[PDB]
Tab-separated table of C-alpha atoms and ligand atoms in Angstrom:
chain	number	residue	atom	x	y	z
A	1	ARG	CA	41.704	-32.792	-30.671
A	2	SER	CA	39.612	-33.033	-27.160
A	3	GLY	CA	41.383	-30.761	-24.778
A	4	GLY	CA	40.668	-30.786	-20.932
A	5	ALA	CA	44.404	-29.368	-20.573
A	6	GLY	CA	44.311	-25.628	-19.932
A	7	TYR	CA	40.666	-25.235	-18.842
A	8	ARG	CA	38.258	-27.150	-16.330
A	9	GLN	CA	35.449	-28.402	-18.349
A	10	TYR	CA	32.991	-28.470	-15.390
A	11	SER	CA	29.485	-29.372	-16.169
A	12	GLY	CA	26.588	-26.920	-14.936
A	13	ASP	CA	24.094	-24.159	-15.539
A	14	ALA	CA	26.118	-20.819	-15.926
A	15	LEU	CA	24.521	-18.592	-13.480
A	16	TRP	CA	25.269	-15.147	-12.062
A	17	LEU	CA	26.837	-17.004	-8.870
A	18	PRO	CA	29.213	-19.725	-8.566
A	19	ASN	CA	26.601	-22.121	-6.994
A	20	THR	CA	22.722	-20.838	-6.775
A	21	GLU	CA	19.423	-22.136	-8.045
A	22	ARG	CA	17.487	-20.528	-10.735
A	23	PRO	CA	14.305	-18.714	-9.748
A	24	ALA	CA	11.131	-20.854	-10.523
A	25	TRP	CA	9.959	-17.977	-12.850
A	26	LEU	CA	13.437	-18.079	-14.644
A	27	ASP	CA	13.375	-21.220	-16.345
A	28	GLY	CA	16.476	-20.611	-18.934
A	29	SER	CA	14.437	-20.901	-22.130
A	30	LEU	CA	14.965	-17.189	-22.939
A	31	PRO	CA	18.172	-15.733	-24.256
A	32	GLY	CA	20.786	-14.483	-21.682
A	33	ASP	CA	18.713	-16.291	-18.568
A	34	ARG	CA	21.391	-16.605	-15.807
A	35	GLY	CA	19.023	-17.101	-13.024
A	36	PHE	CA	19.476	-13.402	-11.746
A	37	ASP	CA	16.087	-12.058	-10.397
A	38	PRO	CA	17.004	-11.198	-6.532
A	39	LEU	CA	14.122	-8.848	-6.234
A	40	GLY	CA	11.700	-11.045	-7.952
A	41	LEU	CA	10.480	-8.488	-10.176
A	42	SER	CA	9.528	-11.014	-12.864
A	43	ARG	CA	8.096	-13.411	-10.312
A	44	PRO	CA	4.426	-13.984	-11.295
A	45	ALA	CA	2.415	-11.192	-9.045
A	46	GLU	CA	-0.381	-12.132	-7.000
A	47	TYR	CA	-3.049	-9.179	-6.487
A	48	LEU	CA	-6.428	-8.934	-4.374
A	49	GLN	CA	-9.535	-7.255	-5.962
A	50	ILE	CA	-11.357	-4.879	-3.332
A	51	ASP	CA	-14.944	-4.188	-3.872
A	52	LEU	CA	-16.297	-0.681	-5.052
A	53	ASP	CA	-16.818	1.536	-2.032
A	54	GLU	CA	-20.455	2.418	-1.333
A	55	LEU	CA	-20.770	6.049	-2.404
A	56	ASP	CA	-24.700	6.331	-2.492
A	57	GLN	CA	-25.955	9.156	-0.416
A	58	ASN	CA	-29.563	7.665	-0.830
A	59	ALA	CA	-28.364	4.899	1.526
B	1	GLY	CA	-15.788	35.145	35.148
B	2	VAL	CA	-13.457	34.253	32.470
B	3	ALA	CA	-13.447	30.661	33.660
B	4	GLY	CA	-17.401	30.862	33.409
B	5	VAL	CA	-17.415	31.744	29.792
B	6	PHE	CA	-14.319	29.926	28.684
B	7	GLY	CA	-15.539	26.925	30.702
B	8	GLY	CA	-19.136	27.565	29.444
B	9	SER	CA	-17.971	27.729	25.781
B	10	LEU	CA	-15.642	24.434	26.284
B	11	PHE	CA	-18.738	22.735	27.697
B	12	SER	CA	-21.112	23.862	25.362
B	13	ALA	CA	-18.886	22.663	22.464
B	14	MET	CA	-18.470	19.222	24.337
B	15	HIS	CA	-21.858	18.424	24.943
B	16	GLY	CA	-22.978	19.656	21.669
B	17	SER	CA	-20.248	17.575	19.932
B	18	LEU	CA	-20.590	14.553	22.255
B	19	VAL	CA	-24.440	14.397	21.481
B	20	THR	CA	-23.848	14.926	17.780
B	21	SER	CA	-21.322	12.357	17.814
B	22	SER	CA	-23.941	9.859	19.305
B	23	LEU	CA	-26.983	10.284	17.215
B	24	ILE	CA	-28.662	7.025	16.580
B	25	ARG	CA	-29.025	6.085	12.723
B	26	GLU	CA	-32.462	6.973	11.645
B	27	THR	CA	-32.062	8.948	8.336
B	28	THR	CA	-30.159	8.448	4.777
B	29	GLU	CA	-27.126	10.675	3.808
B	30	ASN	CA	-29.178	12.837	1.378
B	31	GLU	CA	-31.166	14.054	4.220
B	32	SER	CA	-30.354	16.357	7.292
B	33	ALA	CA	-29.566	14.235	10.486
B	34	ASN	CA	-32.060	16.553	12.438
B	35	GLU	CA	-34.822	14.777	10.332
B	36	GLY	CA	-34.121	11.700	12.578
B	37	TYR	CA	-35.663	13.677	15.588
B	38	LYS	CA	-39.579	14.105	15.535
B	39	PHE	CA	-40.781	16.788	17.902
B	40	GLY	CA	-42.484	14.951	20.761
B	41	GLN	CA	-40.381	11.553	20.681
B	42	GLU	CA	-40.936	9.537	23.667
B	43	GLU	CA	-37.759	7.786	22.948
B	44	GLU	CA	-33.931	9.192	23.107
B	45	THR	CA	-32.329	10.543	19.952
B	46	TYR	CA	-28.655	9.583	20.977
B	47	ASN	CA	-27.103	7.051	22.834
B	48	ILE	CA	-25.870	8.449	26.171
C	1	LIG	C1	31.269	-11.743	-4.918
C	1	LIG	C2	30.627	-13.173	-5.449
C	1	LIG	C3	30.335	-13.145	-6.763
C	1	LIG	C4	30.975	-14.269	-7.585
C	1	LIG	C5	32.166	-15.089	-7.151
C	1	LIG	C6	30.184	-14.183	-9.031
C	1	LIG	C7	30.674	-14.806	-10.137
C	1	LIG	C8	30.130	-14.821	-11.420
C	1	LIG	N1	29.323	-13.980	-11.692
C	1	LIG	MG1	28.450	-12.400	-10.463
C	1	LIG	N2	27.503	-10.973	-9.315
C	1	LIG	C9	27.642	-10.757	-8.154
C	1	LIG	C10	28.812	-11.473	-7.198
C	1	LIG	C11	29.519	-12.689	-7.891
C	1	LIG	N3	29.515	-13.004	-8.637
C	1	LIG	C12	26.881	-9.564	-7.346
C	1	LIG	C13	26.686	-9.045	-6.015
C	1	LIG	C14	26.223	-9.155	-8.373
C	1	LIG	C15	25.099	-8.101	-8.308
C	1	LIG	C16	23.840	-8.367	-7.616
C	1	LIG	C17	26.315	-10.089	-9.434
C	1	LIG	C18	25.788	-9.959	-10.756
C	1	LIG	C19	26.331	-10.800	-12.020
C	1	LIG	C20	25.338	-10.836	-13.110
C	1	LIG	C21	24.634	-9.873	-13.906
C	1	LIG	C22	26.283	-11.363	-13.851
C	1	LIG	C23	27.119	-12.327	-13.218
C	1	LIG	C24	28.074	-13.149	-13.631
C	1	LIG	C25	28.895	-14.152	-13.169
C	1	LIG	C26	29.649	-15.066	-13.466
C	1	LIG	C27	30.573	-14.241	-14.768
C	1	LIG	C28	32.130	-14.692	-14.536
C	1	LIG	C29	33.016	-13.924	-15.718
C	1	LIG	O1	32.021	-13.632	-16.693
C	1	LIG	O2	34.132	-13.779	-15.678
C	1	LIG	C30	34.251	-12.601	-14.451
C	1	LIG	C31	33.825	-11.218	-14.604
C	1	LIG	C32	34.517	-10.213	-14.156
C	1	LIG	C33	34.057	-8.727	-14.246
C	1	LIG	C34	30.409	-15.555	-12.436
C	1	LIG	C35	30.594	-17.011	-12.187
C	1	LIG	C36	27.443	-13.359	-15.098
C	1	LIG	C37	27.052	-14.342	-15.858
C	1	LIG	O3	26.423	-14.324	-16.708
C	1	LIG	O4	27.106	-15.443	-15.280
C	1	LIG	C38	27.332	-16.569	-15.948
C	1	LIG	C39	26.441	-12.279	-15.257
C	1	LIG	O5	25.730	-11.915	-16.236
C	1	LIG	N4	27.082	-11.642	-11.666
C	2	LIG	C1	16.007	-1.146	-18.030
C	2	LIG	C2	16.902	-2.313	-18.206
C	2	LIG	C3	16.727	-3.671	-18.133
C	2	LIG	C4	15.714	-4.390	-18.057
C	2	LIG	C5	14.200	-3.834	-18.319
C	2	LIG	C6	15.750	-5.724	-17.831
C	2	LIG	C7	15.086	-6.775	-17.496
C	2	LIG	C8	15.261	-8.021	-17.274
C	2	LIG	N1	16.235	-8.797	-17.166
C	2	LIG	MG1	18.340	-7.541	-17.173
C	2	LIG	N2	20.147	-6.591	-16.911
C	2	LIG	C9	20.083	-5.295	-17.099
C	2	LIG	C10	19.122	-4.422	-17.469
C	2	LIG	C11	17.664	-4.678	-17.823
C	2	LIG	N3	17.366	-5.821	-17.554
C	2	LIG	C12	21.485	-4.809	-16.992
C	2	LIG	C13	22.025	-3.489	-17.544
C	2	LIG	C14	22.265	-5.877	-16.680
C	2	LIG	C15	23.637	-5.822	-16.491
C	2	LIG	C16	24.159	-5.874	-15.136
C	2	LIG	C17	21.272	-6.982	-16.508
C	2	LIG	C18	21.721	-8.520	-16.356
C	2	LIG	C19	20.870	-9.364	-16.321
C	2	LIG	C20	21.049	-10.715	-16.206
C	2	LIG	C21	22.224	-11.508	-15.800
C	2	LIG	C22	19.723	-11.451	-16.029
C	2	LIG	C23	18.814	-10.397	-16.422
C	2	LIG	C24	17.430	-10.846	-16.499
C	2	LIG	C25	16.486	-10.059	-16.872
C	2	LIG	C26	14.918	-10.375	-17.151
C	2	LIG	C27	14.322	-10.957	-15.583
C	2	LIG	C28	14.633	-9.980	-14.503
C	2	LIG	C29	13.670	-8.995	-14.147
C	2	LIG	O1	12.629	-9.289	-14.571
C	2	LIG	O2	14.067	-7.903	-13.739
C	2	LIG	C30	13.402	-6.824	-14.185
C	2	LIG	C31	14.533	-5.477	-14.493
C	2	LIG	C32	13.930	-4.206	-14.175
C	2	LIG	C33	12.572	-4.091	-13.906
C	2	LIG	C34	14.792	-3.046	-14.443
C	2	LIG	C35	14.448	-2.146	-13.420
C	2	LIG	C36	15.600	-2.227	-12.286
C	2	LIG	C37	16.174	-0.894	-11.247
C	2	LIG	C38	14.960	-0.023	-11.488
C	2	LIG	C39	17.388	-0.379	-11.953
C	2	LIG	C40	18.451	-0.312	-10.862
C	2	LIG	C41	19.308	0.955	-10.942
C	2	LIG	C42	20.652	0.552	-11.757
C	2	LIG	C43	21.222	-0.315	-10.770
C	2	LIG	C44	21.254	1.761	-12.026
C	2	LIG	C45	14.065	-9.058	-17.345
C	2	LIG	C46	13.426	-9.546	-18.638
C	2	LIG	C47	17.532	-12.378	-16.024
C	2	LIG	C48	17.050	-13.115	-17.405
C	2	LIG	O3	17.952	-12.986	-18.395
C	2	LIG	O4	15.727	-13.493	-17.397
C	2	LIG	C49	15.590	-14.377	-18.650
C	2	LIG	C50	19.070	-12.851	-15.898
C	2	LIG	O5	19.792	-13.600	-16.011
C	2	LIG	N4	19.342	-9.020	-16.533
C	3	LIG	C1	-9.901	37.229	26.746
C	3	LIG	C2	-10.212	38.117	27.754
C	3	LIG	C3	-11.672	38.266	28.463
C	3	LIG	C4	-12.744	37.503	28.678
C	3	LIG	C5	-12.747	35.761	28.303
C	3	LIG	C6	-13.540	38.323	29.332
C	3	LIG	C7	-14.794	37.933	29.863
C	3	LIG	C8	-15.867	38.561	30.666
C	3	LIG	N1	-15.505	40.007	30.923
C	3	LIG	MG1	-13.857	40.955	30.619
C	3	LIG	N2	-12.280	42.348	30.312
C	3	LIG	C9	-11.186	42.019	29.592
C	3	LIG	C10	-10.930	40.614	29.058
C	3	LIG	C11	-11.918	39.622	29.154
C	3	LIG	N3	-12.980	39.492	29.672
C	3	LIG	C12	-10.063	43.146	29.533
C	3	LIG	C13	-8.773	42.853	28.905
C	3	LIG	C14	-10.478	44.193	30.373
C	3	LIG	C15	-10.221	45.334	30.440
C	3	LIG	C16	-10.091	46.100	29.199
C	3	LIG	C17	-12.006	43.804	30.737
C	3	LIG	C18	-12.804	44.510	31.563
C	3	LIG	C19	-14.024	43.946	31.961
C	3	LIG	C20	-15.263	44.777	32.453
C	3	LIG	C21	-15.229	46.192	33.111
C	3	LIG	C22	-16.093	44.052	32.826
C	3	LIG	C23	-15.931	42.581	31.959
C	3	LIG	C24	-17.008	41.737	32.113
C	3	LIG	C25	-16.803	40.336	31.660
C	3	LIG	C26	-17.515	39.204	31.595
C	3	LIG	C27	-18.692	39.723	30.635
C	3	LIG	C28	-19.734	38.727	30.157
C	3	LIG	C29	-21.092	38.603	31.222
C	3	LIG	O1	-21.180	38.446	32.497
C	3	LIG	O2	-22.083	39.004	30.187
C	3	LIG	C30	-23.338	39.242	31.205
C	3	LIG	C31	-24.700	39.408	30.564
C	3	LIG	C32	-25.060	41.054	30.450
C	3	LIG	C33	-24.091	42.135	31.050
C	3	LIG	C34	-26.130	41.440	29.853
C	3	LIG	C35	-27.306	40.397	29.714
C	3	LIG	C36	-28.257	40.710	28.944
C	3	LIG	C37	-29.584	41.444	29.575
C	3	LIG	C38	-29.923	40.661	30.976
C	3	LIG	C39	-30.843	41.468	28.710
C	3	LIG	C40	-30.255	42.219	27.350
C	3	LIG	C41	-31.235	41.476	26.361
C	3	LIG	C42	-31.091	42.906	24.957
C	3	LIG	C43	-30.820	44.019	25.486
C	3	LIG	C44	-32.230	42.370	24.070
C	3	LIG	C45	-32.063	41.160	23.141
C	3	LIG	C46	-33.460	41.169	22.480
C	3	LIG	C47	-33.214	40.249	21.125
C	3	LIG	C48	-32.387	41.280	20.332
C	3	LIG	C49	-32.771	39.043	21.135
C	3	LIG	C50	-17.259	37.921	30.810
C	3	LIG	C51	-17.154	36.740	31.849
C	3	LIG	C52	-18.142	42.325	32.732
C	3	LIG	C53	-18.459	41.593	33.895
C	3	LIG	O3	-17.733	41.160	34.530
C	3	LIG	O4	-20.097	41.526	34.193
C	3	LIG	C54	-20.263	42.092	35.234
C	3	LIG	C55	-17.510	43.758	32.974
C	3	LIG	O5	-18.132	44.363	33.436
C	3	LIG	N4	-14.469	42.670	31.553
C	4	LIG	C1	17.761	3.560	-22.666
C	4	LIG	C2	19.463	3.663	-22.382
C	4	LIG	C3	20.249	4.657	-23.136
C	4	LIG	C4	20.032	5.449	-24.171
C	4	LIG	C5	20.836	6.880	-24.428
C	4	LIG	C6	20.703	7.727	-25.414
C	4	LIG	C7	19.728	7.433	-26.382
C	4	LIG	C8	21.812	8.920	-25.291
C	4	LIG	C9	21.259	9.601	-26.473
C	4	LIG	C10	22.453	10.878	-26.437
C	4	LIG	O1	23.684	10.293	-26.067
C	4	LIG	C11	23.469	10.644	-27.482
C	4	LIG	C12	23.317	9.327	-28.446
C	4	LIG	C13	24.204	11.561	-28.166
C	4	LIG	C14	24.094	12.872	-27.011
C	4	LIG	O2	25.035	14.155	-27.608
C	4	LIG	C15	22.999	13.255	-26.786
C	4	LIG	C16	22.356	12.146	-26.057
C	4	LIG	C17	20.797	12.535	-26.119
C	4	LIG	C18	22.441	12.439	-24.689
C	4	LIG	C19	20.086	3.100	-21.438
C	4	LIG	C20	19.104	2.152	-20.452
C	4	LIG	C21	19.731	2.067	-19.289
C	4	LIG	C22	18.938	1.236	-18.488
C	4	LIG	C23	19.750	0.351	-17.360
C	4	LIG	C24	21.194	0.669	-17.188
C	4	LIG	C25	18.876	-0.629	-16.609
C	4	LIG	C26	19.216	-1.329	-15.503
C	4	LIG	C27	18.454	-2.420	-15.078
C	4	LIG	C28	19.141	-3.225	-14.144
C	4	LIG	C29	20.634	-3.404	-13.892
C	4	LIG	C30	18.226	-4.360	-13.616
C	4	LIG	C31	18.626	-5.365	-13.118
C	4	LIG	C32	17.809	-5.987	-12.142
C	4	LIG	O3	16.478	-6.329	-12.438
C	4	LIG	C33	17.207	-7.629	-12.616
C	4	LIG	C34	17.473	-8.100	-14.003
C	4	LIG	C35	16.868	-8.572	-11.715
C	4	LIG	C36	16.246	-7.976	-10.192
C	4	LIG	O4	15.844	-8.754	-9.341
C	4	LIG	C37	17.525	-7.184	-9.711
C	4	LIG	C38	17.852	-5.947	-10.580
C	4	LIG	C39	19.334	-5.561	-10.194
C	4	LIG	C40	17.147	-4.786	-10.329
C	5	LIG	C1	46.452	-11.959	-33.835
C	5	LIG	C2	45.436	-11.372	-32.783
C	5	LIG	C3	45.360	-12.224	-31.936
C	5	LIG	C4	44.405	-12.328	-30.749
C	5	LIG	C5	44.384	-12.892	-29.893
C	5	LIG	C6	43.515	-13.312	-28.850
C	5	LIG	C7	41.984	-12.458	-28.811
C	5	LIG	C8	43.566	-14.005	-27.777
C	5	LIG	C9	42.646	-14.305	-26.713
C	5	LIG	C10	43.137	-15.215	-25.871
C	5	LIG	C11	42.384	-15.384	-24.757
C	5	LIG	C12	42.046	-16.517	-24.279
C	5	LIG	C13	43.278	-17.538	-24.408
C	5	LIG	C14	40.960	-16.692	-23.161
C	5	LIG	C15	41.007	-17.794	-22.756
C	5	LIG	C16	39.986	-17.940	-21.669
C	5	LIG	C17	39.274	-18.952	-21.140
C	5	LIG	C18	39.282	-20.276	-21.885
C	5	LIG	C19	38.566	-18.987	-19.716
C	5	LIG	C20	37.624	-19.930	-19.263
C	5	LIG	C21	36.806	-20.406	-18.677
C	5	LIG	C22	36.894	-20.750	-17.291
C	5	LIG	C23	38.439	-20.761	-16.628
C	5	LIG	C24	36.032	-19.852	-16.768
C	5	LIG	C25	36.293	-22.067	-17.131
C	5	LIG	C26	36.496	-23.248	-18.033
C	5	LIG	O1	37.926	-23.480	-18.090
C	5	LIG	C27	35.877	-22.767	-19.396
C	5	LIG	C28	35.866	-21.146	-19.476
C	5	LIG	C29	36.025	-20.790	-20.824
C	5	LIG	O2	34.553	-20.662	-19.109
C	5	LIG	C30	44.995	-10.075	-32.581
C	5	LIG	C31	45.393	-9.463	-33.854
C	5	LIG	C32	44.968	-8.113	-33.641
C	5	LIG	O3	44.865	-7.269	-32.371
C	5	LIG	C33	45.776	-6.748	-33.120
C	5	LIG	C34	47.064	-7.419	-32.490
C	5	LIG	C35	45.600	-5.515	-33.679
C	5	LIG	C36	44.120	-5.017	-34.095
C	5	LIG	O4	43.952	-3.641	-34.472
C	5	LIG	C37	44.009	-5.970	-35.255
C	5	LIG	C38	43.840	-7.292	-34.679
C	5	LIG	C39	43.720	-8.636	-35.706
C	5	LIG	C40	42.424	-7.880	-33.835
């Protein structure tokens, strides 16, 4: 039957914008992954560790 | 007279607070800062 008659069979990754790129942390493996994370909430977070403040009154 | 006692009260507070703010570390935090001064010291107890 084929088709390509009443529709444009364009090839691409369905994203939330007609042209954009998936964030690095949004691979596309998960169901419903549309590359939608403008705030980067799922971006792997980086943290710094501060040492324990000295609170010894003997010092 | 009022400027004498208001000023004297101001100068006492300023001189006392400035000397206290400049005490050279000679004690720990579990002791009074006063302990850092020994009666008869030949050296200064605060940094002018
Ligand atoms: C004004 C520019 C613009 C354009 C051209 C598009 C276009 C598109 N968006 Mg999108 N979107 C936009 C702005 C825009 N968006 C903004 C400002 C937001 C909020 C930040 C979103 C949030 C958004 C989400 C959450 C989703 C899309 C999706 C889609 C696609 C769904 C098309 C569809 O189902 O039929 C038309 C829909 C009519 C209501 C489509 C290509 C959907 C998708 O899955 O992409 C395939 C999808 O789930 N958009
Ligand atoms: C509390 C509801 C909720 C939660 C927890 C999530 C969580 C997620 N979404 Mg989703 N989404 C939701 C609602 C939610 N969504 C709704 C209602 C829509 C329709 C507009 C969408 C449409 C949508 C799309 C198109 C996509 C996601 C994607 C994702 C994943 C990555 C994005 C991210 O990490 O942001 C975290 C989100 C939150 C921390 C929720 C808090 C957001 C604020 C507090 C709410 C703002 C107020 C609101 C506008 C009213 C993630 C697992 C992406 C994905 O599939 O990744 C695999 C993706 O492509 N979402
Ligand atoms: C906020 C407002 C204000 C302020 C800051 C002042 C401030 C002052 N007033 Mg004034 N006054 C005010 C409002 C005010 N007044 C108002 C509204 C009125 C009208 C009601 C007056 C009417 C008034 C009068 C009539 C007088 C003052 C006087 C004074 C001065 C008295 C302090 C002094 O010199 O001690 C000085 C020290 C002594 C007087 C005694 C010293 C101690 C002796 C030498 C030894 C004592 C030792 C003790 C007995 C034993 C102790 C042993 C052991 C227990 C330790 C002082 C600068 C007096 C003054 O100008 O001085 C002459 C004065 O007579 N005022
Ligand atoms: C839980 C829930 C609803 C539950 C409601 C219930 C049970 C209602 C119960 C009752 O009504 C009944 C049944 C009967 C009534 O008589 C009584 C009550 C008691 C009233 C909806 C959650 C509602 C949750 C919502 C709407 C979440 C929205 C989150 C969004 C849109 C996030 C999107 C993005 O995060 C991405 C994906 C990428 C980022 O970079 C950018 C942003 C945009 C932040
Ligand atoms: C008999 C019947 C028919 C329904 C017809 C429908 C749904 C037609 C949709 C018809 C919908 C059609 C044609 C939609 C087609 C949309 C398409 C292809 C759009 C698209 C795109 C583009 C353009 C973005 C890009 C690219 O080209 C691919 C694609 C896909 O991404 C319904 C019957 C009943 O509804 C009653 C009348 C009463 C109810 O109580 C009971 C029931 C039985 C449900």
